[PDB]
Amino acid sequence: VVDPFTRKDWFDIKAPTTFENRNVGKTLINRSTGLKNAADGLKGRVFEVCLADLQGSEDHSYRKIKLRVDEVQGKNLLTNFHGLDFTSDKLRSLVRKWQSLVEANVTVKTSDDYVLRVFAIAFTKRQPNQIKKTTYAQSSKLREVRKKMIEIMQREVSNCTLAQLTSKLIPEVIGREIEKSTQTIFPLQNVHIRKVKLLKQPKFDLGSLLALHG
């Protein structure tokens, strides 16, 4: 009778420049009218898109990125980094019996007042010549690993902006820094930054958003 889909307009999502492939996709919303503009009814939407589709490599298939629109230019939506998470399957495939799991998180503010919660995860590594069934670290070793995780996450997020942090998240620089820093404690494997959570945004600077789009 009505077809609400007759009154819809389509818009193009755009990723920031920190990612390779920027044409994320398309969304739709009612046409802008006298009462409600489409822009403000559309600013603030969040899109979850796989990192593999953003970069063009299946090596990033297990991470997915949240992109939040905060400016509309004609038919383009300018989105910014809104968070990182693992797919459920990858996280389940990592967690396994006969080995220790060690986890840490920290709340840290970027160089440009972006407040984040960062979650690191790691598992004890089995040595090539090992004969014993289990690979457990004593609780003190896990505590020291956790301390290293937190202080490196602190250092690497505090001394950079949200865009530089987005650039750092892609090649797992923090993960490799954790792996290197904890070799002398206990061999570790699958050291990941498994989740990044955006707790606070600062005052919106439109000019800095445009700097990251084209």
Binding site: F5, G25, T27, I29, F47, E48, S88
Partner: protein, 127 residues
């Protein structure tokens, strides 16, 4: 290129939901349930009802402009079962064979990191 939506399939043991949105999920494209395709409550979760619902969803997506869908599959989750209901697979297959193109697939079942008390009491459901 393709225009992607997100097919959000909620397959419980009582029903199956074939629900396509846009990428944000804030706009519904089509929503059809297994219970729309049968006249009996007992087979609202049947694979055949799920496949019928998936075809009708696929037709609606075709006429709207959706040409492909990513897959978000969930069980009931929470304190309830984590195993997907029987219609989820048939709905997934019908979507893939309907002409829509397929993107990523993920399981999004709600999983507690421990939780509230599940119903049924200490001695369980006594059948």
């Amino acid at each position: 290129s393709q225009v992607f939506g997100v097919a959000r399939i909620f397959a419980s043991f009582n029903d199956t939901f074939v629900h396509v949105t846009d990428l944000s999920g804030k706009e519904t494209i089509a929503r059809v349930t297994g219970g729309m395709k049968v006249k009996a409550d007992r087979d609202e979760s049947s694979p055949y009802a799920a496949m019928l619902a998936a075809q009708d969803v696929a037709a609606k997506c075709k006429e709207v402009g959706i040409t492909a869908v990513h897959i978000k599959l969930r069980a009931t989750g929470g304190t309830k079962t984590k195993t997907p209901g029987p219609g989820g697979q048939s709905a997934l297959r019908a979507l893939a064979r309907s002409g829509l193109r397929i993107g990523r697939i993920e399981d999004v079942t709600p999983v507690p990191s421990x939780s509230t008390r599940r119903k049924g009491g200490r001695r369980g459901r006594r059948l």
